[PDB]
Design a protein around this ligand. Structure first.
Ligand code: MG
Ligand code: MG
Lengths: 216, 193, 99, 43, 56, 142, 136
RNA sequence: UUGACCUCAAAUCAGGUAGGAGUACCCGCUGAACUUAAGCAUAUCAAUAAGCGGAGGAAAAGAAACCAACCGGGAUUGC
RNA sequence: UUGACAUUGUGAAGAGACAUAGAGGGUGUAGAAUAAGUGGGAGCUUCGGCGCCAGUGAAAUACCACUACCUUUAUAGUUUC
RNA sequence: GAAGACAUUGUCAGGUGGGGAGUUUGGCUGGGGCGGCACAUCUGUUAAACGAUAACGCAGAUGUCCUAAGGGGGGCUCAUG
C-alpha cells in the first residue's frame, strides 16, 4: 500500500477539524472518497464491479423502498420501511413519468426472490439505466438487517467514465472508525482493480461542504 | 553394472589414459645422477658449502603455526641489524628475501643471532692472494640446525582461580557472535534523540 | 589490536611482542605528486570536456546528482567511479561558476 | 525424384504444395512462381 | 504519423513507388485488388449508420 | 484447472478442443492409416465458437490434445446500453461485463429488446473469455 | 568482428551443441594477428611489442615495433642482444609477446589455475598416471 | 635560380637475413565424431584425434597487481 | 528481413509526446435557460436569494469536489519524429 | 560524374527459414498390424472349504462426490400389503 495509516490519520484530522469546529453545517456531512483510475480502458478491459459492507453505517437515514410480497409487506410494517405490493406495481401500469418519479424518490430498492423475476417486466429497464436496481431478500433473512446492510453497502462498478466516488461515512463518527473504513475501502478498490496500486490515478478524501484533500 | 553389496567406486579411466602412463623405472639411476650432480657441483664450488644459509621462520596457518621451519631468505632489516649489506651478504652466502617483513621480535632476534653465529663460523678469503684452503663442509643447514623454541618449563605450580576455561571460550564466542548487533542497538539508542 | 591469548573470539591469537616494520615505498604508488598534478591540470585546461562529461554537467544543472550518478554509473563501470566522477564534475561546476 | 527437386516424387506427377513461392524463401526452395501477385489466365 | 505502422508503409512507398504517376498507381492498385478492399470498408461504415436509421 | 487433456481417438463430434490456444468445436473428424504398418492419423476440422473461424489439425491418434471447460449459463436481460448487456442471475445477482453481440444475433436481440419481449440469453465461458450465443423468449412466467 | 566458422553452407555435421556458425569468437586478439602478419611480412626482424593507434567500424589499427637481430647496434648493446638468441624466433607466433601472454592467460593467482604454466602442460600433468617401483 | 627538410621510390647498388626438412618431447590456433548415459538432444569421449603456425637441447614459466587470515608465509618448475 | 548502437561530421525549419506553473471551454430535441459527465447534497445563503416538493428531460438544476476530453501560454526544461 | 552522413560494414535483438543438420517415432499380444488394456487399482467368481494361484477367462467398476453425505447425542422405524 502506497497510502500510509499515519497520513490518513493526519488528513482525517484536518478534515474533521474543518467540518466540525471551524465551519459547522446544519445538515449532517458525509465523508466522500473520489477516485480516478489510470491507464485503463472501459471499452476493452473487463468492467470490474464489486460490493463491500462497512461495519458502521455511512448513511443511517437514506430512503429505501422494499418491493415485496404479502409476507415481506407484513414484515415491512414492523420494519417501518416504505413498500408497494405487486398489485401496486401492476397499478402503476409501466408509466414512465411516475416510475421516473419513483426512481428519483428512492435511492435504494430491496425486492423478494419470487418477484425479482417480474420486477423488470412490470417496471422496465429504466432502473438499470439509472443504476438503482433492487437487491434480493429472502423470507429467512431479516429485512431491517438487510436495510442496515444496504445502507452500509459500498459498490464500485466501472461503467464508462474512469472516475468513481463512494461515501465512506459521516463526519460525526470517531476518527479511528473513519480511518479504518477509508483504508478498507481503498483496499477493496485495489482488490477489484487489476494490476493493483499502479492503475490508481488519484484518491481524494472530502467532506460534504468541505475542501478536497489528496491522498496520493 | 551395479551388483552385490560393494562400495561405490570412482575410477577415472574413461579417457585415453594409457597414452599418459609414467612409470618411474629411472628412480635408482636418477638418484645416482643426482648424487653425481651434487658431487660435481661441490667440486666446482670446492670451498663453498653447496647451499645458502636460510632463516628460521614461523609456518603460516593455524594448523602449522605451532611449528617453526626454514624460510627463503633473511629480511633486509635483519641483515642491517646483523651489520652487513644485502649485496655483501648475498656474495658471502646468505639468502636475502626482500619481500618478507618483521612483525615478531622473537623471530627477528633468532634470525639476527643466527646471522651472528654464521659470521663467526665462516672464513672469507681475500679476493687476490693466498687462498688458505679450508676443507669444506657440505651443509650449512646441518651446521646450523633449526631448533624448535622451548615454550615452557616441565613443572610449575597450579594457579587456579575459578573460570573453568570453558565458560571463557563460550563467552568469547558469544560476544563475537553478538558484537555487531550490540553496536547497532547502541547507535540507534544514541540517535534516539 | 593486541591478541587475547585464546583460540577464538574477537582478537584471537597468541600474544607476541610486535615490531611495526618500516613502510614499503610501493604502498604509496597512487600518491599524487606536484609535477603530475600540474600536468593533469594543464591538459585538462587544454582538452576540456568529453561529451558524456558535458551531459553530466547538464544533469547536475538540471536533474540533480541522483540522476547524474545513475547516468554516470551506466556510462562508467561502477558506482564508485560514478561517485568520484560526479564529485569532480561538481568541482568543475563550482570552479567555472567562480570563473 | 524428390532428392532432385521440390516437385519431384509421388505416385502421380503432381506438385504437392502450392507452386507460389515467398520472396523470403531461401536457395533450394525458390522453384516455381516466385512472389506471384496473382496467377492464372486473366480474360 | 502518430498511429502505429504508418512509418513502415512510408518507407516502402518512398523506396519503390517514387517514380510513378497517379494513373499508374490507380491501375496497379486495382490489379492488386487493394482498391476493392478500401471500398468495402467504406461500405461497412455506411451500413452501420444505416442500421441505426432503420431502428429509428 | 481451466483445461484438461484428452486423447484424439477419445474425442468425437460436437466436442470442444483447444487448437492454437483457441476454444474450438469440432465439425469433422477423419482417421487415415499413415502407412500400412503404421498407426492412423486423426484429421480434425473445428470451428472457433467465439470468432467462427475454421481451424484444422492432423495428429497421431495416440497423441493427447488439450480440451477446454465450456459452461453455458442462462440469464435474463435488464438493459442493452453502449454495447454492453446487463444480465440478472437466479438469486438476484447482476452482471454488466458481457459485451453485446455484434452480428445478426445482436441485431435481432436489439430489435427484440426495443419492441419489448422478455429475452432469455445464453452466454458461454471458455478459457477466460465471455460471449453471448443465443436468445429465446420465456413462454410462461410472463 | 567475430570469426565465422569456415564450413560450406553452415553445415557442421555433428551434435547440436556444435552447430554454431555466426557468434563464434577467435581466441587470440586482433593485436596478436596484426603483429603475426607483420612478422610474416618481415621474417628477418623480431617482433617486440604493438600498440593501438586508431579504429573505425571495419578495421582496427596497430603499430608494431620490430628489432633487427643482425644489425651490429643490437648485436652489441647488452640491454637488447637477448633478442638475437634463437629461442626468440617468432615470439608473436608462439604467443610470447605481451598480448600473447594475455591471451594465453599467463598470470599469477587463483584466477589462473587452468592457465598458469601452460594449459596443455597442466592438463597433461594432472591427467598423467604416476606409478612407482614400489607401488604406493 | 640555388640549397635544405619531410614523405615516397628505383638500382644485378655495399653487406646481410627469411623460407624447406625433422617434429619423440615443447608453445599456440583450430577442432570432431565413434563411445558412455543400457534410447537420446545438455553432458561424456575431449578443451582429445585429424588440420595449421612457431622453437630448443630442452621448451615454457619465473622474481607477485601472489598465497593467506596465521605467532603469517615469500620467484618459477617437479615429486 | 526488421530494430538499436558504432562507423558519423556539419546546418536550418516543422510537428508530436511527457514533467510542473497557471488559464479559459463544452448548444439534437424538450425543458426558465448552453445538461461534458460522475458522486455527495437538503438545506446553503453574500442577495434573503438560490435550490429542494414541482415543471420538462435518458440524464435537473443550489451549494461542493473529482475525472476525462479540448483549446491555451512559459521553462537555461526533458525529449522523440 | 552520381550518391551522401542515408546506403555499406561490425556487434547484438525479434521474425522467417525441411534449403540444410542432428535425433525420436512405447509395451502386452495364440506372428506382426488394426482392435482392446488383461500397463496403476477395486468387488464377486474361475480357485479345487487356511493362505497363494494363470489366460486378450466370466459379470462389473475407479481417476469422483460430500462442511456434511465428517464427529457426538437424542427421538423414531423402514420396503410392502
Ligand atoms: Mg511430387
Ligand atoms: Mg573475421
Amino acid at each position: 500500500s502506497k497510502i500510509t495509516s499515519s497520513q490518513v490519520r493526519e488528513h482525517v484530522k484536518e478534515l474533521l477539524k474543518y467540518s466540525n469546529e471551524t465551519k459547522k453545517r446544519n445538515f449532517l456531512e458525509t465523508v466522500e472518497l473520489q477516485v480516478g483510475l489510470k491507464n485503463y480502458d472501459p471499452q476493452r478491459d473487463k468492467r470490474f464491479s464489486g460490493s463491500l459492507k462497512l461495519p458502521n453505517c455511512p448513511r443511517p437515514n437514506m430512503s429505501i423502498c422494499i418491493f415485496g410480497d404479502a409476507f415481506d409487506v407484513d414484515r415491512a410494517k414492523s420494519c417501518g420501511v416504505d413498500a408497494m405490493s405487486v398489485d401496486d406495481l401492476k397499478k402503476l401500469n409501466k408509466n414512465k413519468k411516475l416510475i421516473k418519479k419513483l426512481s428519483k424518490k428512492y435511492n435504494a430498492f430491496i425486492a423478494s426472490e419470487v418477484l425479482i423475476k417480474q420486477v423488470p417486466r412490470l417496471l422496465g429497464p429504466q432502473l438499470s439505466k439509472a443504476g438503482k436496481f433492487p437487491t434480493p431478500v429472502s423470507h429467512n433473512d431479516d429485512l431491517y438487517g438487510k436495510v442496515t446492510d444496504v445502507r452500509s453497502t459500498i459498490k464500485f462498478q466501472l461503467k464508462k467514465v474512469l472516475c468513481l466516488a463512494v461515501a465512506v461515512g459521516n463526519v460525526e463518527m470517531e476518527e479511528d472508525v473513519l480511518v479504518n473504513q477509508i483504508l478498507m475501502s481503498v483496499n477493496f478498490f485495489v482488490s477489484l482493480l487489476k494490476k493493483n496500486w499502479q492503475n490508481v490515478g488519484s484518491l481524494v478524501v472530502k467532506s460534504s461542504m468541505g475542501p478536497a484533500f489528496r491522498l496520493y | 553394472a551395479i551388483s552385490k553389496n560393494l562400495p561405490i567406486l570412482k575410477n577415472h579411466f574413461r579417457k585415453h589414459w594409457q597414452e599418459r602412463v609414467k612409470v618411474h623405472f629411472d628412480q635408482a639411476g636418477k638418484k645416482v645422477s643426482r648424487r653425481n650432480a651434487r658431487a660435481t657441483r661441490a667440486a666446482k664450488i670446492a670451498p663453498r658449502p653447496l647451499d645458502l644459509l636460510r632463516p628460521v621462520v614461523r609456518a603460516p596457518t593455524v594448523k602449522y603455526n605451532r611449528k617453526v621451519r626454514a624460510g627463503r631468505g633473511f629480511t633486509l632489516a635483519e641483515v642491517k641489524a646483523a651489520g652487513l649489506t644485502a649485496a655483501y651478504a648475498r656474495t658471502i652466502g646468505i639468502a636475502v628475501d626482500h619481500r618478507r617483513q618483521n612483525r615478531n621480535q622473537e623471530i627477528f632476534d633468532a634470525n639476527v643471532q643466527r646471522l651472528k653465529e654464521y659470521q663467526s663460523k665462516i672464513i672469507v678469503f681475500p679476493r687476490n692472494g693466498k687462498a688458505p684452503e679450508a676443507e669444506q663442509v657440505l651443509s650449512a643447514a646441518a651446521t646450523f640446525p633449526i631448533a624448535q623454541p622451548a615454550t615452557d618449563v616441565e613443572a610449575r605450580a597450579v594457579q587456579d582461580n575459578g573460570e573453568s576455561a570453558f565458560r571463557t571460550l563460550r563467552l568469547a564466542r558469544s560476544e563475537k557472535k553478538f558484537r555487531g548487533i550490540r553496536e547497532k542497538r547502541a547507535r540507534e539508542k544514541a540517535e534516539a534523540e | 589490536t593486541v591478541k587475547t591469548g585464546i583460540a577464538i573470539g574477537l582478537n584471537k591469537g597468541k600474544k607476541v611482542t610486535s615490531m611495526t616494520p618500516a613502510p614499503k615505498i610501493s604502498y604509496k604508488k597512487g600518491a599524487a605528486s606536484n609535477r603530475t598534478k600540474f600536468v593533469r591540470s594543464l591538459v585538462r585546461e587544454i582538452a576540456g570536456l568529453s561529451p558524456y562529461e558535458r551531459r553530466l554537467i547538464d544533469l547536475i544543472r538540471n536533474s540533480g546528482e541522483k540522476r547524474a550518478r545513475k547516468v554516470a554509473k551506466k556510462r562508467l563501470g561502477s558506482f564508485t567511479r560514478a561517485k568520484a566522477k560526479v564529485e569532480e564534475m561538481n568541482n568543475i561546476i563550482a570552479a567555472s561558476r567562480r570563473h | 525424384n524428390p532428392v532432385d527437386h521440390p516437385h519431384g516424387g509421388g505416385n502421380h506427377q503432381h506438385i504437392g504444395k502450392a507452386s507460389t513461392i515467398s520472396r523470403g524463401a531461401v536457395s533450394g526452395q525458390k522453384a516455381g512462381l516466385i512472389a506471384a501477385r496473382r496467377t492464372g489466365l486473366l480474360r | 504519423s502518430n498511429v502505429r505502422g504508418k512509418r513502415g508503409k512510408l518507407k516502402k512507398i518512398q523506396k519503390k513507388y517514387a517514380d510513378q504517376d497517379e494513373t499508374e498507381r490507380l491501375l496497379r492498385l486495382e490489379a492488386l485488388g487493394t482498391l476493392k478492399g478500401i471500398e468495402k470498408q467504406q461500405q461497412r461504415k455506411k451500413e452501420e449508420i444505416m442500421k441505426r436509421e432503420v431502428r429509428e | 484447472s481451466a483445461t484438461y487433456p484428452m486423447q484424439c481417438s477419445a474425442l468425437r463430434k460436437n466436442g470442444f478442443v483447444v487448437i492454437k490456444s483457441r476454444p474450438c468445436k469440432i465439425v469433422d473428424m477423419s482417421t487415415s492409416k499413415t502407412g500400412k504398418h503404421g498407426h492412423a492419423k486423426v484429421h480434425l476440422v473445428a470451428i472457433d465458437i467465439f470468432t467462427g473461424k475454421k481451424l484444422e489439425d492432423l495428429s497421431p491418434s495416440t497423441h493427447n490434445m488439450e480440451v477446454p471447460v465450456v459452461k453455458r449459463n442462462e440469464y435474463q436481460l435488464l438493459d442493452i446500453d453502449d454495447g454492453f448487456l446487463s444480465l440478472m442471475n437466479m438469486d438476484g445477482d447482476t452482471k454488466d461485463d458481457v459485451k453485446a453481440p455484434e452480428g445478426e444475433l445482436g441485431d435481432s436481440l436489439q430489435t427484440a429488446f426495443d419492441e419489448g419481449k422478455d429475452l432469455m440469453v445464453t452466454i458461454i465461458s471458455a478459457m477466460g473469455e465471455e460471449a453471448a450465443i443465443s436468445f429465446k423468449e420465456a413462454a410462461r412466467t410472463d | 568482428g567475430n570469426r565465422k566458422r569456415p564450413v560450406p553452407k553452415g553445415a557442421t555435421y555433428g551434435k547440436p551443441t556444435n552447430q554454431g556458425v555466426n557468434e563464434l569468437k577467435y581466441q587470440r586478439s586482433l593485436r596478436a594477428t596484426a603483429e603475426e602478419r607483420v612478422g610474416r611480412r618481415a621474417a628477418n626482424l623480431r617482433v617486440l611489442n604493438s600498440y593501438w593507434v586508431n579504429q573505425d567500424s571495419t578495421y582496427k589499427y596497430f603499430e608494431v615495433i620490430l628489432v633487427d637481430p643482425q644489425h651490429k647496434a643490437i648485436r652489441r648493446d647488452a640491454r637488447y642482444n637477448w633478442i638475437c638468441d634463437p629461442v626468440h624466433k617468432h615470439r608473436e607466433a608462439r604467443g610470447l609477446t605481451a598480448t600473447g601472454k594475455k591471451s594465453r592467460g599467463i598470470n599469477k593467482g587463483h584466477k589462473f589455475n587452468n592457465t598458469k604454466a601452460g594449459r596443455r602442460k597442466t592438463w597433461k600433468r594432472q591427467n598423467t598416471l604416476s606409478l612407482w617401483r614400489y607401488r604406493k
